[PDB]
From a paper:
ACs contain metal ions but not organic cofactors, and use ATP to activate substrates through phosphorylation. The first structural rationale for acetone carboxylation is presented here, focusing on the 360 kDa (αβγ)2 heterohexameric AC from [name] in the ligand-free, AMP-bound, and acetate coordinated states. Like many carboxylases, AC is a heteromultimeric enzyme complex. Its architecture consists of two heterotrimeric αβγ subunits joined by the interacting α-subunits to form a dimeric core.
In the absence of bound substrates or nucleotides (ligand-free form), the AC structure has an open cleft at the α/β subunit interface leading to the nucleotide-binding site in the β-subunit. The ligand-free structure is assigned as the resting state awaiting the binding of substrates ATP, acetone, and bicarbonate at the nucleotide-binding site. The ligand-free form of AC contains α-Glu89 positioned at the C-terminus of a Mn-proximal α-helix (residues α82–87) which blocks access to the Mn active site from the α/β interface. However, the structure of the native AC shows the nucleotide binding site located ~40 Å from the Mn site of acetoacetate formation, with no visible pathway for the transfer of reactive phosphorylated intermediates.
Residue numbers in the entry:
A (entry chain A): 14 to 776
B (entry chain E): 573 to 621
C (entry chain B): 622 to 717
D (entry chain C): 2 to 167
E (entry chain B): 88 to 572
F (entry chain D): 14 to 259
Write the structure that this text describes.
C-alpha cells in the first residue's frame, strides 16, 4: 500500500528516515551539502523570495476578513509553510510561536498514523488547538491543510488565529476561574473538519455553540481557511512555474540553512562559556477574589525557572532548566513545545533576524526540560488558558544571559535586558451593546515597554515577547467590540525600570462600563513580583496592581458638572480619582489576578500594561534625560532625586531643568549612603542562612523550594552547598501546611490508549 | 478486554500453547468469537487483553 | 450588509497620441552628430559621441560611449551599453 | 568595517541612528571586540590589560606583573580571582520592607518583599552599582557568567591567550 | 523633511497622549521583513504635535453618536487660550467618534474660532469631522494634522495659479491628482488628498503608455531634482492601499503603493566630519542647480556638479542653453570640498559619488521588487526622471529586466500622466442595508429600492457637477457601484 | 438529486409530509385505519413480538461489555428503534427517557439538512449528547446508526449509556462546580463519529482526553455500538424474512 508522500513512503516512514539522518549526521536530514543553494543559487533565492512574499501577503490580506480587532488590526495571526515531515520552510511574521506548535500537531498526526485513519486527503481541512500536543492555549486555533502535487503530499500549510474566547469558565481568552483542563475551554485534537474544501455541518453547529463570541469565531475560521488556501494555491503556482525538482530540494535545504544560520550567528555575536539566570512570577490564589471551585487550588505559589545556558566553541548551545518548579492548579502551565518555541521566537528577535526563519534554529538548539516541571508537565488534567504568565516570565531571563555575551564582545547595539510581563489582560463577559452574549480580551498588552539597551532607553508602549510588531489598536475600533468607553490613555509613569538607560514605560487605559448588561470583569497579570530584571545595574520594571470602582455615582457626577476621573492613575500612591468618588466601592490593591466580578454601567476598571527593565547604575544616567523623563511623563519627579541623584528645578515656563551642582553633590552623597547602608555579602549571608535554618519565609516561598528540590536534585545539591546546610535540615513539601495535590501522583497523556507522543526535548 | 467485568469462554484451537505465534492464535480466536457474541465493531483491542 | 453606494462619471477627452513612425535603417544620420565630450567612468576617459535626440530616426542604434541630448533630456549610454529607438519615440537600453 | 569614532559613540550612548541601524541590520564586523576593548582600555586610569568587559564599570583584567586574572571595578578595586563570583566579595543592600521598596517604586507598583526582594550590589571603594538581583527570600547569590576566555581568544578571534598565572 | 508649521492639537481630555504614543505601530511602520522581527530596530520618530501643544476637552460621544459625557464648554475655552498663548500656528481638533456625531467637535471648533478672534492672531482651525470623517482616531488625527502642518503653506498655490489662469482666460476648473490615482477638484479644502500628486502623475502615464503598447507589467522609476520614485504596475493596474502608512504615519486616505529614496540631481554632497564618508542629501538644491550655476548662490556641491565634472551634462544645454552652467565652478568646488579632503582627483572625487549613487539606487530598485515577491525579469522598466535617463545604466545594470525603456518625453513624464488622466467625477453615500440569507422578496425589494434611490441621488450629483463644467448629460458615461460585506 | 428515504423523498420532506397529516387529521401520519393490524393481525403481532424481543435482548447482551457497573449491573442503558421520521416503534426497558431524546436528535438532523452535509450514509455512526437539543444531561451519550434497505433509509437505531463523567468542572456525573454551559462537560452535537462501521481516530483521541474515567467511557462506546449493530442486523433479518411492505 503506497504511502502518500512524494516518495511512495508513508508520512511516518518519511519522517523516521529524516530524523535518523539528522541524528546520525548532525545536519538536518543529512544534508552535508546544499545542492540547489550551492549549485543553482539564483533559482534558490527566487523560490525563497517568491514564497516568503506569498505567506507574508496571505496573512496581511486574509486578516481583513475578521471581525475581532485582535486579528484584523493587531495581526495576532500567523501563516506557516511546512515540508512533508512537518518542518517549517518559511513564515509570515506575527504570532510565529505557532511555527513550532502547528509543526508538532502535524507531527502528532504523522506519529499516530492519521494516514491510515482518518486519512490525509487532498482538499481536506484539519482544525486543532490541543495544548497536550504542544499548543500555547486553547484560544489559539490552528487550521492545517495538506498540500498535494500530482497525487502525493509535498507539505502542509498552517494558519493560526487568536480567538476571543473558547468557552472556558472564565469569560475572556486568558481566563481564570477554571483550575484543570475540564473547564479550560473547547479543546480540538487534530480533527478532520472539512473535506473537498468544505466544512462539516456537525462541526459548525457544535463548535459555534461551545463559545460566547460566535460571529467573531466564525469569521476567525474564514481568516484561517482563506490564508491556507491562498498559500496552497501559491505553492502550486510556484512548483508549476519552476519545477517539482527544485521545489523539493528547497523544501529541505531551507531547513538546514536555518540551522547553519543559527550556528554562524552565535559564533559571530557571542562568547563561549556558561550563563546563569533565573525568573519568577506570582500566583496569589489564596486571596478572597480568586474564587475557584476546587479547595486544593487555594494557595499562593511562585513559578521558579532557573536556566543554565551553555554556549560551546563549535557554535551549538544548550538550555538546561533543572531546578524548575511543578505544574499547578491554575491556567499558567505550558508544554515542552510551548516553551521551546518561545525561546525560538526570541532568537528570531536578536540572533537570526537576518537568517532563515524556520525550524532550522530549533534543530541547532539543545533543550533539557525535566519531566514534571511546569514547562513539561506529566499530567493530562493540567490547564493552559494563560500559559504566558509563566512562559513570558521564563524567557525574559535569557535576554540577560544572551546580552552579557554581546556586551563583552562589543555588540552593544544588540544588548537587551529582557521583555516586559505581557500583561494585564482586560477580560469580561455578558451582554454587549448589540445585546448579544459576548466576551472581551483587550490586546492593549501587545504594546508594553521593552528592555533598555547598553546604548539607549527601551521603547515605551511598543511590543510583546510573542509579537515584536506592537500595536495598541485604535480606541475607536476597540469600542466597537467592547461595551466600555475610554476615559483615558496615558503613558504609565515610573513603570519603566530605572537605570543608566531606562526601560520602556507601559501605558494605562481607564474604562467606564457602557451599554453592557449582566456584565462581569476580572484582572490577570503579575502583582507581587516583577518577572524582568534589569541588567549590569538596572532595576526591574514595576509590578502590577488593580483598580476598580463600583457604584461610582458617575451618572449624577457627569450630569451635575462635578469632577470626574480622567486619563491615567498617575501616582497610585497619591491617587486623585478616589477623592472624586465619595460613594464608590473602590478596589485598589495588589491582587492582580481575580475571577469574574459583577460590574454595571458607569463602574470603573483600570487597564495597566507593564514596563521593561533598565540598564546600568541609575546614577550614571545623563541628568538631562531624567529631567526630560519628568516633563515627558515617564518618571515621577519624586524619584528623580531618590533614584538618579538628579536635582531638578522648575523653570518660569513650568518645565523641569537640571540643577547641575546640586545633581553632582547629590550623586556624591548617594555613593556614601550606599557604602554606609550595605554590608559585606559574608555578613548578609549568615543572616539569611539563619532565616533558612529556621524556615523563616512565607508558605509560597517554602513551597517553591520544596517542589523545586524534588524535581531538580542538582539544584537542591547546589542550594545546600551554597548555604552550607546540614543534612539534618530538610524541607518536605507536606510540612508547609498548604495543599499538595498532584505532587506525587500523576498520569500523562501518553498513558492513554493509542497515544504516541513526540519528544523534542531532553527531559 | 482489559478493564472488563465479564469474560467469554473459548475452546482452545491449539492442544498445546508454547510459542509466540500460538499466543497470537489465542487472542485471534477470542476477537473472532467476540465479533460473534456481540458485533464486529464491539471489538476494542487497543485496551489490551 | 450593504455599506455604501458609488457613482462614477466619465466624459471623453483627447488623450495624448503615442507616435507610430515607420522604422528605418539602424545607421543614424550624419545630421544627428553634434561632436563629442570628455566622458570619465571606470578610471578611463573616452571621447563620447553626442547625438541630437530629435534628429534620431526610428530603428537607429547608438553604441556607447554616447550622450543623447535634446532641449531638456540627457540620456547617458556609457561605454559598455547600447540603445536603439523604436517607432514610438521610445529608446531601449541593452546591456551589450 | 566601522569607523573607530563610531564605535566610541556607541559606547558613549551617542551614536547616530543611521549607523545604529547599519550595525544592527548587516553582518557584524569581526574587528569589533579588539577595537572595543582597546577603546575601554584608554579610558581606565590603571594600565593593567583588560581581558573581557563584565559591565559598564566592571572587567576581567590581567595584573601587569603577576599575570593573574581578576575582576576589577573601573576605579581600581580587585574583587576576586576571575573564576569566582565577584558578588561574593562585594557589598549588598537588600530591599525587604515596604519602606525600602517605596524608595524606588511608588506604592502598589512596588513588589511585595515577602515574595520578591531587590538585592543591590556595590563596589566597596566607589559605591558603584554593578548589578541588582530580584529573587525570592532564601535564594542563593547568582554567578552570572563564567566565560570560556581561552576558546574565545584562541578559536573565535584567532588571538593568543593573554599570559596567565593562578 | 519635517519642515511644517508649529501646529497644535485639542483632543478628548484624558487621552492627550495618543498622538505621541503612535499607536505603538509607528515604531516599525514600513519595515522590511528582517527589521519587523529585529526588535532593537524599532524606533519612534518625533510626534508631529509635541505634548506641550496638545490640550484636552471634557467630552465623550459613544460609537453611535450618544453623548455620554456632554461637552463641558469651559474646558474648550481654556484649551483654545492655552494654544493661542503658546503661539500655535494652527489648531487641530480631534474628538472620538465625531465622524458619527460631530455636534461636540464642531462646538469646540466654534469656541476655538471665537477665542482666536479675540486674540487678534491669525490661527486657522481644523475639525477632523470637517476634513476626514472616518474611524480609527490615530489615522484621522494624523491626516487632519497634515492640513495644518504641511498643507497650509501650499494652500495659497492652487488659488494663485487658478486665479492667474482665469484672469488669463481659462474657462475650466483645474483638477488635481489625488492619492488613489484619480483626479479631484482644485477647490477641495482637503489638500492632503493631493500630497503625492506628482509621483502618481508618473505612475499614471506609465500605466497609460503600457495600455497603448501592451506592456502589462511595468516598474516605474523616476529621478527628480530631489528623490528617486519607484512603483510597480502589476497586470495593467496599480495597487491602492486603503488605510496606509506613509512617512511612518498612519493615514485615512487611500494611497497608491509607491516607494522612493531621497536622492536626485540636486541632492547635496557632504562628507561626515569624522568618518569622511560621502552622504548624499537628504536635502536638495532645487531650482538652484548647485555650484555650477554662477547666480544660484549655492556653495555646497550637488550630484549635478559631478555630472558636469564627469562630462554627463552639457554646460551649454541646461534648459536648451537658457541657463549658464560653468564646469570650472563645479571642478573647484568638488576639489576643495570632496577631492582634497579625500586625497583623490576631481575626476575620482566625482566618479565615486556617481558610483555610490548608482549602486544605492540599484540595490533599492532590486529590493523593492524582491520584497514584493517578483523577479525583475517579469517586468519592463520605464525610466523617466527628467534626471533618471542620466542613470538608467546605473540602477538597471544586470538586474535582468525584460526591457528598459527611456521614452523621448521622459522629462515631463508626470505632466504627461496628468494630461492623460481620465475626466472622471466620483460620488459616495453610506448606507445601512442588513439582509439575512433567507429573506422574503419584500424585504428584498425594499433593500433594492433604497440602494436604487441612493444611486439616483448620486447620479444627479455627478451630472450636476458636469453641467457646471460645461458638459451635458449626453456626454457623461455612468458606472454605478456599491460596497458590501 | 433524489432523497435518501425509502420513498425517494428526503428526510425533511418525508417528516414534513407526515407531521402535516398528523396536524390536519389528529392521528399519527393520517392513519385513520391500520391496514396491517386490521388486515393481517397475525403478521402484525409476529413483527411486534420478534422486534421487541430483539431490542430487549440487545440491551441485555451488550451491557456485559461495560466496565462501569452503572451499565453492567444497574442497566442504566437503553436501546430504541425508530422509523425514518424519527418516531420510536419499540424500546427495551431501562432509561427509556431517551426514547424521546434520541428521537429529538434524529429530528434535529432532519431539520438542519444533515442529509446534504455531512450526509447520512450506510454504515455511518453518529454520536451525540447535546442538551440544548433536548438531551437530559451531558453524561447520557447517544450512539445513532441509520438503518438502510436496498440503498434507502428505513429507520434508525439509538443507543444510550449513562457515562461516569464527561469532564465537567465537578468530578462526577451529577456534577456541581460549573454554573454555565462553559464547564458543564464534553458536549457532542450529532457528530459523525464513524463511517464504514469504524470509529474515527481523531474522535477517539480527542474524546478520551476530555474525560476522567477513560477506560469506562471507551467500553461504554462499544456497548452502544454493539447494541445498535445487533439491532440493525435484527431488522434486516426480519425484513428479509417478512418483506419490506409489511
Ligand atoms: Mn493566544
Ligand atoms: Mn444520566
Ligand atoms: Zn569601585
Amino acid at each position: 500500500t503506497r504511502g502518500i508522500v512524494r516518495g511512495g513512503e508513508t508520512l511516518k516512514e518519511h519522517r523516521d528516515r529524516l530524523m535518523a539522518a539528522t541524528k546520525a549526521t548532525g545536519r538536518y536530514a543529512g544534508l552535508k551539502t546544499l545542492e540547489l543553494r550551492e549549485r543553482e543559487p539564483i533559482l534558490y533565492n527566487k523560490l525563497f523570495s517568491r514564497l516568503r512574499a506569498g505567506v507574508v501577503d496571505a496573512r496581511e490580506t486574509a486578516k481583513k476578513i475578521a471581525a475581532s480587532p485582535i486579528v484584523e488590526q493587531e495581526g495576532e495571526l500567523c501563516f506557516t509553510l511546512y515540508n512533508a515531515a512537518g518542518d517549517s520552510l518559511l513564515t509570515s511574521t506575527g504570532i510565529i510561536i505557532h511555527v513550532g506548535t502547528m509543526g508538532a500537531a502535524i507531527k502528532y498526526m504523522i506519529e499516530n498514523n492519521w494516514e491510515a485513519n482518518p486519512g490525509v486527503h487532498d482538499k481536506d481541512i484539519f482544525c486543532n488547538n490541543d495544548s497536550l500536543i504542544g499548543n500555547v492555549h486553547p484560544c489559539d486555533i490552528h487550521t492545517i491543510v495538506p498540500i498535494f502535487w500530482e497525487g502525493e503530499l509535498i507539505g502542509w500549510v498552517g494558519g493560526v488565529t487568536h480567538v476571543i474566547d473558547t468557552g472556558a469558565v472564565g469569560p475572556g481568552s486568558m481566563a481564570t476561574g477554571q483550575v484543570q483542563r475540564f473547564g479550560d475551554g473547547y479543546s480540538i485534537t487534530c480533527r478532520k473538519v472539512g473535506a473537498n474544501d468544505t466544512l462539516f455541518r456537525d462541526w459548525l453547529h457544535e463548535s459555534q455553540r461551545m463559545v460566547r463570541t460566535t460571529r467573531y469565531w466564525m469569521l476567525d475560521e474564514r481568516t484561517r481557511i482563506a490564508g491556507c488556501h491562498m498559500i496552497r494555491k501559491l505553492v502550486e503556482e510556484v512548483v508549476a512555474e519552476e519545477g517539482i525538482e527544485a521545489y523539493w530540494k528547497f523544501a529541505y535545504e531551507a531547513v538546514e540553512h536555518g540551522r547553519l544560520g543559527l550556528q554562524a550567528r552565535i559564533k559571530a555575536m557571542t562568547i563561549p562559556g556558561t550563563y546563569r539566570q533565573v525568573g519568577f512570577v506570582d500566583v496569589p490564589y489564596a486571596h478572597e477574589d480568586v474564587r475557584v471551585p476546587s479547595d486544593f487550588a487555594k494557595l499562593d505559589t511562585i513559578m521558579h525557572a532557573p536556566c543554565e545556558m551553555t554556549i560551546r566553541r563549535d557554535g551549538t548551545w544548550r538550555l538546561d532548566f533543572e531546578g524548575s518548579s511543578r505544574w499547578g492548579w491554575h491556567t499558567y502551565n505550558a508544554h515542552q513545545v510551548s516553551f521551546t518555541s518561545g525561546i525560538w521566537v526570541m532568537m528570531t528577535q536578536t540572533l537570526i533576524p537576518s537568517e532563515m526563519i524556520n525550524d532550522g534554529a530549533a534543530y541547532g538548539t539543545e533543550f533539557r526540560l525535566p519531566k514534571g516541571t511546569w514547562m513539561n508537565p506529566d499530567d493530562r488534567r493540567v490547564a493552559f488558558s494563560y500559559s504566558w504568565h509563566f512562559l513570558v516570565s521564563a524567557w525574559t531571563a535569557l535576554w540577560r544571559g544572551l546580552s552579557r555575551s554581546y556586551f563583552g564582545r562589543g555588540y552593544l547595539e544588540e544588548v537587551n535586558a529582557g521583555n516586559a510581563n505581557t500583561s494585564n489582560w482586560l477580560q469580561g463577559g455578558g451582554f454587549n451593546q448589540y445585546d448579544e452574549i459576548h466576551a472581551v480580551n483587550s490586546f492593549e498588552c501587545a504594546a508594553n515597554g521593552t528592555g533598555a539597551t547598553a546604548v539607549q532607553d527601551g521603547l515605551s508602549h511598543a511590543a510583546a515577547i510573542w509579537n515584536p510588531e506592537g500595536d495598541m489598536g485604535d480606541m475607536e475600533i476597540w469600542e466597537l467590540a467592547e461595551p466600555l468607553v475610554y476615559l483615558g490613555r496615558q503613558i504609565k509613569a515610573s513603570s519603566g525600570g530605572s537605570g543608566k538607560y531606562r526601560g520602556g514605560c507601559g501605558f494605562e487605559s481607564l474604562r467606564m462600563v457602557w451599554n453592557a448588561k449582566d456584565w462581569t470583569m476580572f484582572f490577570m497579570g503579575n502583582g507581587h513580583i516583577s518577572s524582568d530584571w534589569g541588567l549590569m545595574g538596572g532595576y526591574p520594571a514595576a509590578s502590577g496592581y488593580r483598580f476598580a470602582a463600583h457604584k461610582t455615582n458617575l451618572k449624577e457626577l457627569i450630569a451635575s458638572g462635578a469632577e470626574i476621573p480622567l486619563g491615567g492613575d498617575t501616582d497610585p500612591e497619591n491617587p486623585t480619582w478616589d477623592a472624586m468618588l465619595p460613594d464608590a466601592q473602590i478596589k485598589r490593591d495588589k491582587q492582580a489576578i481575580t475571577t469574574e466580578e459583577m460590574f454595571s454601567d458607569y463602574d470603573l476598571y483600570l487597564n495597566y500594561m507593564r514596563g521593561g527593565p533598565g540598564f546600568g547604575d541609575p546614577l550614571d544616567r545623563e541628568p538631562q534625560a531624567v529631567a526630560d523623563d519628568i516633563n515627558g511623563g515617564y518618571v515621577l519627579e519624586r524619584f528623580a532625586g531618590e533614584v538618579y541623584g538628579v536635582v531638578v528645578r522648575k523653570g518660569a515656563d513650568g518645565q523641569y531643568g537640571v540643577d547641575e551642582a546640586g545633581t553632582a553633590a547629590a550623586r556624591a552623597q548617594i555613593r556614601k549612603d550606599r557604602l554606609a547602608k550595605s554590608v559585606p555579602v559574608s555578613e548578609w549571608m549568615k543572616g539569611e542562612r539563619e532565616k533558612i535554618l529556621a524556615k523563616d519565609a512565607g508558605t509560597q516561598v517554602r513551597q517553591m523550594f520544596a517542589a523545586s528540590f524534588k524535581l531538580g536534585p542538582r539544584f537542591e545539591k547546589d542550594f545546600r552547598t551554597f548555604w552550607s546546610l546540614p543534612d539534618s535540615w530538610t524541607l518536605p513539601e507536606e510540612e508547609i501546611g498548604v495543599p499538595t495535590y498532584g505532587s506525587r501522583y500523576s498520569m500523562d497523556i501518553s498513558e492513554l490508549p493509542d497515544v504516541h507522543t513526540v519528544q523534542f526535548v531532553e527531559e | 478486554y482489559r478493564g472488563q467485568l465479564n469474560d467469554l469462554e473459548i475452546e482452545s484451537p491449539l492442544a498445546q500453547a508454547h510459542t509466540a505465534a500460538d499466543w497470537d492464535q489465542l487472542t485471534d480466536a477470542f476477537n473472532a468469537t467476540y465479533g460473534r457474541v456481540y458485533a464486529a465493531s464491539a471489538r476494542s483491542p487497543e485496551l489490551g487483553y | 450588509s450593504v455599506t455604501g453606494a458609488i457613482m462614477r462619471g466619465m466624459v471623453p477627452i483627447p488623450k495624448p497620441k503615442i507616435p507610430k513612425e515607420p522604422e528605418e535603417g539602424e545607421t543614424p544620420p550624419e545630421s544627428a552628430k553634434i561632436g563629442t565630450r570628455k566622458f570619465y567612468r571606470k578610471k578611463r576617459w573616452v571621447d563620447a559621441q553626442l547625438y541630437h535626440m530629435e534628429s534620431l530616426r526610428p530603428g537607429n542604434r547608438v553604441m556607447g560611449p554616447a550622450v543623447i541630448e535634446s532641449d531638456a533630456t540627457t540620456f547617458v549610454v556609457p561605454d559598455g551599453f547600447e540603445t536603439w529607438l523604436d517607432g514610438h519615440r521610445l529608446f531601449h537600453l541593452r546591456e551589450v | 568595517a566601522y569607523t573607530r569614532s563610531k564605535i566610541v559613540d556607541l559606547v558613549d550612548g551617542k551614536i547616530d541612528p543611521d549607523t545604529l541601524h547599519q550595525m544592527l541590520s548587516t553582518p557584524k564586523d569581526p574587528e569589533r571586540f579588539v577595537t572595543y576593548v582597546e577603546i575601554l582600555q584608554e579610558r581606565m586610569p590603571w594600565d593593567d590589560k583588560i581581558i573581557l568587559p563584565l559591565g559598564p564599570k566592571l572587567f576581567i583584567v590581567q595584573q601587569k606583573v603577576s599575570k593573574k586574572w581578576t575582576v576589577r571595578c573601573e576605579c581600581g578595586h580587585d574583587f576576586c580571582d576571575w573564576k569566582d563570583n565577584w558578588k561574593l566579595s562585594a557589598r549588598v543592600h537588600v530591599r525587604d520592607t515596604p519602606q525600602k521598596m517605596e524608595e524606588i517604586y511608588p506604592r502598589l507598583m512596588a513588589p511585595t518583599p515577602s515574595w520578591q526582594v531587590i538585592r543591590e550590589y556595590f563596589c566597596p571603594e566607589c559605591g558603584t552599582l554593578h548589578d541588582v538581583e530580584a529573587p525570592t527570600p532564601w535564594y542563593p547569590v547568582i554567578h552570572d557568567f563564567s566565560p570560556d576566555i581561552e576558546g574565545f581568544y584562541q578559536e573565535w578571534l584567532g588571538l593568543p591567550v593573554p599570559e596567565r598565572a593562578d | 523633511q519635517r519642515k511644517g508649521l508649529k501646529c497644535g492639537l485639542i483632543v478628548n481630555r484624558g487621552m492627550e497622549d495618543f498622538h505621541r504614543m503612535g499607536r505603538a505601530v509607528q515604531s516599525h511602520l514600513g519595515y522590511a521583513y528582517e527589521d519587523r522581527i529585529h526588535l532593537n530596530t524599532h524606533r519612534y520618530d518625533p510626534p508631529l504635535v509635541p505634548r506641550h501643544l496638545t490640550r484636552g476637552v471634557v467630552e465623550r460621544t459613544d460609537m453611535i453618536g450618544t453623548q455620554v459625557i456632554p461637552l463641558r464648554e469651559d474646558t474648550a475655552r481654556d484649551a483654545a487660550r492655552d494654544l493661542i498663548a503658546a503661539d500655535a500656528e494652527g489648531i487641530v481638533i480631534s474628538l472620538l467618534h465625531s465622524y458619527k456625531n460631530p455636534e461636540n467637535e464642531r462646538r469646540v471648533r466654534d469656541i476655538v474660532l471665537e477665542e482666536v478672534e479675540k486674540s487678534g492672531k491669525k490661527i486657522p482651525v481644523f475639525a477632523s469631522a470637517d476634513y476626514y470623517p472616518v474611524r480609527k482616531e490615530t489615522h484621522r488625527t494624523n491626516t487632519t494634522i497634515l492640513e495644518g502642518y504641511a498643507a497650509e503653506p501650499s494652500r495659497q498655490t492652487l488659488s494663485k495659479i487658478s486665479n492667474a489662469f482665469k484672469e488669463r482666460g481659462t474657462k475650466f476648473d483645474f483638477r488635481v491628482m489625488a492619492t488613489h490615482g484619480g483626479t479631484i477638484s482644485w477647490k477641495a479644502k482637503e489638500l492632503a488628498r493631493t500630497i503625492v500628486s506628482g509621483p502618481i502623475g508618473g505612475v499614471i502615464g506609465a500605466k497609460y503608455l503600457g495600455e497603448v503598447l501592451g506592456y502589462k507589467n511595468i516598474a516605474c522609476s523616476d529621478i527628480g531634482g530631489t528623490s528617486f520614485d519607484v512603483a510597480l504596475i502589476t497586470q495593467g493596474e496599480m495597487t491602492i492601499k486603503n488605510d496606509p502608512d506613509m512617512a511612518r504615519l498612519v493615514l485615512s486616505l487611500p494611497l497608491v503603493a509607491m516607494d522612493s529614496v531621497g536622492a536626485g540631481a540636486g541632492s547635496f554632497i557632504r562628507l561626515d566630519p569624522y568618518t569622511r564618508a560621502i552622504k548624499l542629501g537628504p536635502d536638495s538644491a532645487g531650482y538652484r542647480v548647485g555650484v555650477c550655476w554662477k547666480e544660484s548662490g549655492i556653495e555646497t556641491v550637488t550630484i549635478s556638479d559631478c555630472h558636469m565634472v564627469l562630462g554627463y551634462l552639457n554646460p551649454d544645454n541646461f534648459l536648451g542653453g537658457a541657463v549658464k552652467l560653468d564646469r570650472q565652478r563645479s571642478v573647484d568646488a568638488i576639489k576643495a570640498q570632496i577631492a582634497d579632503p579625500l586625497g583623490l582627483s576631481v575626476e575620482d572625487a566625482a566618479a565615486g559619488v556617481i558610483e555610490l549613487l548608482d549602486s544605492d539606487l540599484r540595490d533599492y530598485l532590486r529590493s523593492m521588487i524582491s520584497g514584493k515577491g517578483y523577479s525583475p525579469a517579469s517586468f519592463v522598466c520605464f525610466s523617466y526622471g527628467g534626471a533618471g535617463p542620466v542613470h538608467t545604466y546605473g540602477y538597471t545594470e544586470g538586474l535582468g529586466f525584460e526591457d528598459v525603456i527611456v521614452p523621448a518625453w521622459a522629462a515631463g513624464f508626470s505632466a504627461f500622466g496628468c494630461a492623460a488622466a481620465d475626466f472622471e467625477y466620483r460620488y459616495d453615500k453610506s448606507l445601512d442595508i442588513n439582509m439575512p440569507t433567507e429573506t422574503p422578496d419584500t424585504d428584498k425589494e425594499k433593500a433594492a429600492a433604497t440602494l436604487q434611490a441612493a444611486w439616483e441621488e448620486l447620479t444627479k450629483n455627478v451630472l450636476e457637477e458636469f453641467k457646471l463644467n460645461g458638459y451635458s448629460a449626453d456626454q457623461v458615461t455612468l458606472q454605478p457601484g456599491y460596497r458590501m460585506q
